[PDB]
Design goal:
The chain contains three helices and seven strands; from the N terminus they run E-E-H-E-E-H-H-E-E-E. The chain is α+β, with helices and mostly antiparallel strands and about 160 residues long. Bound molecules: a molecule of 2 linked components (NAG-NAG) and 2-acetamido-2-deoxy-beta-D-glucopyranose (2 copies). The site of a molecule of 2 linked components (NAG-NAG) has 11 residues, from strand 2 and helix 1. It is classed as viral protein.
């Protein structure tokens, strides 16, 4: 049994990239990845990670600033299906500002502005970008299907 993505305590949205498969982005306080690794030494896994993230950037038309910043992250695969977990650092205004030039923040600002969440707030405005503040501890991405997007798929 795995926890739900479509829950009252979470925010979620599903990107359909092709007829069958897509990405489910989930803001939650439950984590699915125990470790803190992102073993991408194989070229094929490193490219599936690039492609999941590219499909989010193009659909949301994200323009991520370069601030020499970095969001804590673990990743993992289950038979070619990626699971990416960001351990967010945006609980304060200072933390939101220091983790602003990241894919996580651009995603969250899309949730805030499409009203898919109420727990996202503005912090600092810089370079035409909004730094997002939130109490959510994780942002989860999984390569999944439309029929399963409401339940977290097994990561490994
Ligand atoms: C979701 O996962 C699949 C599997 O990793 C991704 O792509 C295809 O996977 C098959 C193996 O089942 C490979 O033989 C193909 O070469 C892969 N195609 C591509 C274009 O990479 C699929 O792209 C993933 N979807 C998302 C949205 O990340
Ligand atoms: C997530 O966890 C933080 C505590 O770290 C809490 O303040 C926040 O309200 C929680 N949000 C949800 C939706 O449970
Ligand atoms: C990356 O994953 C492979 C798969 O087993 C593993 O052998 C390798 O040691 C990992 N990378 C590092 C630096 O350990």
């Amino acid at each position: 049994t795995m926890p739900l993505s479509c829950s009252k305590n979470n925010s979620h949205h599903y990107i359909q990239v092709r007829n069958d498969t897509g990405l489910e982005l989930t803001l939650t306080n439950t984590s699915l990845l125990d470790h803190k690794f992102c073993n991408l030494s194989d070229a094929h896994k490193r490219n599936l990670y690039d492609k999941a993230l590219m499909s989010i950037v193009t659909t949301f038309h994200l323009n991520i600033p370069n601030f020499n910043q970095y969001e804590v992250m673990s990743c993992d695969f289950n038979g070619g299906k990626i699971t990416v977990q960001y351990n967010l650092s945006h609980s304060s205004y200072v933390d939101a500002a220091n983790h602003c030039g990241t894919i996580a923040n651009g995603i969250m600002d899309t949730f805030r502005r499409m009203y898919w969440s109420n727990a996202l707030s503005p912090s600092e405005y810089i370079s035409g970008t909004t730094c997002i503040q939130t109490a959510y501890q994780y942002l989860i991405i999984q390569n999944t299907t439309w029929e399963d997007h409401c339940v977290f798929s097994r990561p490994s």
